[PDB]
Amino acid sequence: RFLKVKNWETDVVLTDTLHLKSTLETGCTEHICMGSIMLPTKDQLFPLAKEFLDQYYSSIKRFGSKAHMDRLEEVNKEIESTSTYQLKDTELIYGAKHAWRNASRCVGRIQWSKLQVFDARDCTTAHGMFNYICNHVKYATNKGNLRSAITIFPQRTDGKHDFRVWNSQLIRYAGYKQPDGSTLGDPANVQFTEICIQQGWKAPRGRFDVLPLLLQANGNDPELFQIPPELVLEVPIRHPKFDWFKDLGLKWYGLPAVSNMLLEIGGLEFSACPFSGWYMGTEIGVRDYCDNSRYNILEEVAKKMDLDMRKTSSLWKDQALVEINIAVLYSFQSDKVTIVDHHSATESFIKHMENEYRCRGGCPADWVWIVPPMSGSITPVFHQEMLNYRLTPSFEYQPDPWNTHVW
Template sequence: MNMFEVEQFLTQYKEEMELTDSWLKERMNEVRNNHQFDPSSEELIFGARVAWRNSNRCIGRLFWKSLHVFDERDLEDEREIYEALLRHIKFATNNGKIKPVITVFKPGVVRIWNEQIIRYAGYETEKGILGDPSSITFTKVCQALGWHGEGTHFDVLPIVIQVDGREPSVFEIPKEYILEVPILHPHYKEFEELNLKWYAVPIISNLKLSIGGVEFQAAPFNGWYMGTEIGARNLADVGRYNMLPKVADLIGLNSSSNSSLWKDRALVELNIAVLHSFKEMGVSIVDHHTAAQQFKIFEQQEKEGNRQVTGDWKWLIPPMSPATTHIYHQPIANIIKKPNYFYQKAPDYELYLK
């Protein structure tokens, strides 16, 4: 137990919740007497929300106070943890009106092996890669654990849960829990031929939540998508679905010369299709210009709260037309504050890849 981090967090909690000095003294004495810091439900909610506020790589922090926290620290049974994750998916999806949600499990005991709770599989085949290339290794792990996909470009991977170092358990997500959006274009009907789609809720599950020195290795959380995450990265990156050449060919662009800017034009049309498709289905999404404007409001609110605005500039600028946003033109301090979410060492896959 790191008493410095505990006191730092509880002092921040006291100040922002407008509690008394005597409360802080009593709480610190309680921690010392118990020889451990076990955040109360109220402290956990505050910590998870402030961790979002402190997330330097997130442009969507304006809504940090709206994060809904499910406290599931009492669960140690794999199936019960799986059922809690299904509750998370259903609550967050909210028929398309996405809600920001985090589910926190017992620290040092529960681990979720997925990078995201919902993600598509990737297969190496004789005809090339099928599905998402970034998922190839984890797909192999799932197969070694007994899972078999349908062999399409958009097979949803199962959830892999490990408790207390035991053999990991594999659970399929029922299809009715997964809201997916077919990607169509408002002007180019030919987009139907690409048979693209994407899932509605990005639930990050490979980061740990750090609150007062306590590290929660399983704390999956979500907001909603910014359009470029799908249209300029997931579907466009060469190391992902690499759709720009197909989009260019589909809409008749000359891709024989870089100077024709065919990649840029294809990228714009793909992003238009993503935003159009989500909005047509009534699924929450934000374009990068609106997200940047929202971040500006967040900056103003932080200054009014006498808090330094921090951020990782290269992550905050959108991957498309970044110079059209104010973020591109200003410096920002990449100072790490806690509570926060941090990358952690991946589970040991090697046993299942031999």
């Protein structure tokens, strides 16, 4: 029932009790582990509400008080009557911060409590959504001094009137398939780019074309909007030692802002809730640039370094990989856009584990996602056993809206 996690580098042992307050399902069984898999009513709503409010009122040290009990009745009277209910601003703020606190795949959670929450529940149109989003981007960007933030659109009702940001991130580059066979721009985004062009977008058909936002309010058909170029902070990528590196003509955006997740608080579902923080360097240098299925530039870089690419054993992919990542970090730092390296981010997470063990009884963590995609074992998270479990409030995946929505 009590569970131990050990660090094999420092010999330090923590005891987990938070997992008993666990609530959703992992995908695993005692027969088979699924840790490496990417995706595994009035009667339904009240327990969920009760569960959340109980945790809310406990955290402000007001458990079992008159203010607690009255709110429980108030939400109950509202469910039995309206088939749903509304969160107070305080509960909304608390729910969002805890969805992040509980995100077992996020290495940046040391920051969980400094989340700026923007309440967009009064939104009714896609033009309104666009306005809210532009304000979020500008506030979060903050001329390079990035600040975490989330904007929360109206909760799901009958599921026929969902708000959705069709973009998977607020700021992403287009992807175009060509007769050549190869891909121009970002291959992850080819399909969404087809939908933009098919809804009317005039594509510049270049390598780094910032996608338009595709916004759906109240279950209606979505609409296109171009984020003002002056709000999209981008960084050209150069190297501190390699002058030729600029001639690759690489750039990336300063703001990572995930816009396709569903935020679940007290059984209420927020289908549109873009959130943003700041990049860990490997996210761009390792995955975005170096994934076979993404910009896939390794081949091109190692060539410029005049390395022996005859045999895998010269570790030429690995040499190029490190320099690509040196450059990203350097470029951001020199243009003064917040960014964190994987050594620094993992060291912060470990300290954050310790705090959550001592202050909360544990910290849900998904080792497969916490360990950075390069140099894993020279970061302190590699040697750290972690327990993975699902708590609410939470962020969840949801189907791409284009498969679901009807025109």
